[PDB]
């Protein structure tokens, strides 16, 4: 107890934070581990995802070695300022924090051989590019890039501790709309003309679940188009009925397209859902134009030929359009 206190005092005495371990020696090797609690949210509008996690950095330092105390020491969180820590930052971070209730989620653990382990609970809102061109049938690939700020590869070398076992909690992630297909870890050195800087990267591939979209966005449009096709089987002189059917189908299509504001209106890009809705709109418009032709040709100046070929060509053309769309986008 007392001798433990004097051991800690001797360890911290004459230890300059401004000096890295082996200032003139070979570079210090930092092993990084992550235990990710969950990915809290993924927003396409702001183009980013929120990740909470336990970042651990492990490194050796001869200055902080002790002896005669075989048990492993876990010092208080207030020693972080007293001890030197590597400068590490997330390149694609927009806003992150270290939890601070009831106390700061920060741990420093020393070992008798001078080794140090530093752990932090961080919630980072990292930013990842998204290709919402194939939305909602897309498959995003988001990344977290860890990099040293001041030091080059000649002074600090980042690596994954445990190879492919560095990152854990992918099973623990549970996103409502997305589903994780694969995760990857890549360590490398970004090469600059001035020098080389180390970098690590943890990447996730996130497929999107399409059952919800197929139920809400796609199915009503198909049903409305099929309803618009009903006009061809009604008597050609039923002007009020056929015109009301066609124009109300057009109105329903427009109503769906406008209150579809849930599906990414705030940021505007041409996605795949937009093309599908446009195709359905064009089909119902052509359906009404067909009765326009029928009325003018046959009423003014034994089924009529226009309806006869329309009944066969409208479903066939819509099926071909659907086949082309699904094959191209999948």
């Amino acid at each position, epitope marked *: 107890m007392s001798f433990v206190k004097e051991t800690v005092d001797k360890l911290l005495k004459g230890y300059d934070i401004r000096l890295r371990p082996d200032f003139g020696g070979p570079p210090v090797c930092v092993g990084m581990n992550i235990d990710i609690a969950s990915i809290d949210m993924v927003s396409e509008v702001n183009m980013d995802y929120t990740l909470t996690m336990y970042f651990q950095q492990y490194w050796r330092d001869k200055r902080l070695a002790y002896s005669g105390i075989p048990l492993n020491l876990t010092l208080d969180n207030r020693v972080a300022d007293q001890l030197w820590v590597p400068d590490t930052y997330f390149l694609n971070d927009k806003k992150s924090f270290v939890h601070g209730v009831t106390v700061k989620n920060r741990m420093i653990r020393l070992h008798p051989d001078g080794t140090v382990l530093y752990g932090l609970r961080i919630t980072t809102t990292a930013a990842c590019m998204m290709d919402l061109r194939r939305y909602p049938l897309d498959e995003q690939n988001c990344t977290l890039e860890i990099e040293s700020y001041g030091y080059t590869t000649d002074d600090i070398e980042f690596y994954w501790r445990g190879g492919d076992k560095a990152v854990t909690g992918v*099973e623990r992630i549970e996103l409502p709309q997305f589903s994780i297909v694969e995760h990857r870890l890549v360590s490398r050195n970004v090469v600059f003309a001035t020098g080389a800087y180390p970098r690590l990267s943890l990447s996730f591939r996130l497929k999107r679940n399409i059952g919800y979209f197929i139920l809400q966005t796609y199915m009503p449009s198909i049903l409305i188009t099929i309803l618009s096709w009903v006009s061809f089987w009604i008597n050609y002189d039923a002007s009020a009925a056929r015109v009301a059917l066609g124009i109300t189908t057009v109105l329903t299509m427009t109503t769906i397209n406008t209150h579809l504001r849930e599906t990414l209106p705030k940021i505007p890009y041409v996605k795949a859902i937009d093309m599908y809705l446009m195709g359905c709109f064009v089909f119902v418009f052509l359906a009404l134009l067909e009765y326009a032709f029928v009325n003018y040709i046959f009423f003014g100046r034994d089924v009529n030929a226009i309806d006869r070929w329309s009944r066969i060509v409208f479903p066939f053309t819509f099926s071909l359009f659907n086949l082309v769309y699904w094959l191209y986008y999948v």
Partner: nanobody
Amino acid sequence: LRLSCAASGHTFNYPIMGWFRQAPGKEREFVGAISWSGGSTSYADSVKDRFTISRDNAKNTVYLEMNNLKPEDTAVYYCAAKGRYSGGLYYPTNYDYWGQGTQVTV
């Protein structure tokens, strides 16, 4: 060989489910775990690429596929489920509800 572990009850509260094996005169050792949603699984290095785990959204739930029978596979295999926040896949003590042992002696 194909194994199937069917779960009934409040299965959402116990998302991650995995497999353990106990040889005679030995402790239970981890064999592979699978998450609740879709394909997100982990396997032990000692038995990688010879045991595979898949999931179905049904009461039958998870399936396991076995290859390369060996004298080190003479162990009874238990199916277990874990709480959402009970960290540690490889440790049996973190798991609450267990199945039974199926001897796979060569």
